[PDB]
Amino acid sequence: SMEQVAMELRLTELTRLLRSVLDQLQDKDPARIFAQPVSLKEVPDYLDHIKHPMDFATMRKRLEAQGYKNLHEFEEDFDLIIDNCMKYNARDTVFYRAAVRLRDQGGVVLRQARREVDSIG
């Protein structure tokens, strides 16, 4: 139907917007601390601590599969990256501090993304 095509066009455009958001968020992680899943070879107990691991590569996979139906689902995954890190790593670590900086700087990008999604529809 035409309605399905229109829906698919909107999702493709949402995906385009979120791709831009993801690139911007990732730029705020210059150390690439969050670029890839935490290695279970290097951190074998990681899943005892963190029940829902997340990272930017995994988000990008879902993104290109058009697996984010709305901005909320995308934000949930971004929050997992930060919140997982701030639990697994102690406050006085480069990892915890990277997550805080990513959270703070990312908030700006996400704030404008929410306005754009609402506005464009």
Ligand X SMILES: CC(=O)N1CCN(c2ccccn2)CC1
Which residues lie near ligand X (CB under 6 A)?
33, 38, 42-43, 85, 88-89, 95
CB nearer ligand X, residue 25 or residue 85: 85
Task: Provide the residue type at 103 as one letter.
Answer: R
CB burial readout 74-108, b (16+ within 10 A) else e:
bbebbebbbebbbebbeeeeeebebbeebbeebee
Q: Are 48 and 63 in contact (CB under 8 A)?
A: no
Least Å from the CB of residue 94 to ligand X: 9
Q: Which residue is nearest to ligand X (CB)?
A: 42
C-beta separation of 90 from 71 below 8 A:
no
Report in angstroms how near the CB of residue 28 gets to ligand X at its nearest: 15
- Considering the complex, state which of residue 43 and residue 100 has its C-beta at the smaller distance from ligand X: 43
Cβ proximity to ligand X: between 75 and 83 the closer is 83
CB of residue 71 vs ligand X: minimum separation in angstroms? Answer: 24
**Whether the Cβ atoms of residue 22 and residue 61 lie closer than 8 Å to each other:** no
Of 89 and 105, which has the nearer Cβ to ligand X?
89
